[PDB]
Amino acid sequence: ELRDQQEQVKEDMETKCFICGIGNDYFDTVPHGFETHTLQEHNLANYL
């Protein structure tokens, strides 16, 4: 159960965004785009 928790976190950080909570097929009509979306558009540290 401990390992299942530690893998559920990785799934919800590589399938949805954190803040806008969209999904992943939307930000990948751009070539290589969800990485830019969670590193420049929102990127949790910048709200901090």
- Residues 6 or more apart whose CB falls under 8 angstroms from that of 22 comprise 16
- Closer to a second copy by CB, 21 or 48: give it: 21
| DSSP code for 5 | H
Residues of span 5-44 touching Zn ion by CB under 5 A: 17, 19-20, 42
Kindly tell me which residue out of 9, 21, 40, 48 binds a second copy, with binding defined by CB under 8 A: 21
For residue 42, give the nearest of 29, 25, 27 by alpha carbon: 27
What residue type is assigned to position 38 of the chain? T
Positions in the binding site for Zn ion (CB under 5 A):
17, 19-20, 42
- Residues in contact with a second copy by CB under 8 A are 1, 3, 21, 23, 25, 28-33
